[model samples]
Target: MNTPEHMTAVVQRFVAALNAGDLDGIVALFADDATVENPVGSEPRSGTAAIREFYANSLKLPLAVELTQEVRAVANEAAFAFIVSFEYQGRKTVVAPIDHFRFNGAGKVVSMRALFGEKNIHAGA
Candidate 1:
């Protein structure tokens, strides 16, 4: 079982990589066969190639990512709430998402799921 500290550190690194738009760094924390479901209804992306593609698309815009609350970690699982702000098509928006991560025995993330609703998205003036 992964410790809480280890899981929290992984989440921190994930947010840091996202803020920096370092796609490589973001993908480095995952296991080779990891699965990522960004947004509840979307089809999950599996494996390194798909995960890489997913982050590549997300980083198209310069994102201001910040951890909005403390991470909750227990029993090889971790969850965190964060905000990702960006501008697109002349409109600025901030998306607040709660992401959950499941770590493998080796401390690599094996599954990642992001949850957010329409209400969680705010239009920025």
Candidate 2:
């Protein structure tokens, strides 16, 4: 709430990386053995290479959160929650809730996850 100390900064950096569409910049924030867990049920990606690939391929959401509520942080972790707009075929881009981030000691995001709404599979279907 009070603009988290270290965690807030880390989260901000990460967000900047995404907004810039800078995969390398995002990767730079991670440690050698960083782990990113997106969509809790899916497999977690570990290491820089895997993390980079995961972001480049798996993520359909733009680098930025389209409709967001607030950005909050605690210690070395920060969470930015927003809706994820996705394009499903010719349909509209579905907006799902996305908890943008959480960071580790090196100020790199070690974990990232998303929360989807009911029947959110098809974008505005």
Candidate 3:
């Protein structure tokens, strides 16, 4: 597979981890200083420690998300946009957001960001 194909595999692995709700597993795929934004643009949190904390809190709400479509890739970056619906706090919420990925030379994600709307998600905390 080419670099783009490899990147797509990385995305697949990421989704697998997310679907399994393996937050730590997801983190394992990242570098030590890797960063993941809860929402792209403004930095809500940074670094592995903070990312872990965020994931911990997120797991409590048990987020269930699925990718509806993948927006194409350009250069070495791609965004996986999705239509997701899940139950949290006894309420069902549906959201459409694009999760962006930045890969390194070794085919590992060094940075990630999710563009979400100004809405409510039980796992937002």
Best by lDDT: 1
| Candidate whose TM-score is highest | 1
Worst 10 residues of 1 by lDDT: 116-125
Residues 17-67 of candidate 1 have per-residue lDDT tens digits of 998999999999999999999887899999999999999999999999999
Better of 2 and 3 by TM-score: 3
* Clash-forming residue pairs, model 2: 84-96, 86-93
Clashes of each: 0, 2, 0
Per-residue lDDT, model 2, residue 96, is: 59
Query: Predictions ranked by lDDT, top down?
Result: 1, 3, 2
- Candidate 3 deviates by what RMSD? 3.6
Candidate 3 lDDT over 1-125, as tens digits, reads 22777777777777777777898888876766778887767865667898788777766655557778765666777788775566756667766778888877666677888888766333432
Report the Cα lDDT for candidate 3. 0.72
Error of model 1, residue 103, in angstroms: 0.3
- Candidate 2 lDDT over residue span 1-125, tens digit each: 32367666666666677666788887887777877776767787888889889878745455333435656777666666655444545666645555656665556666676665565444553
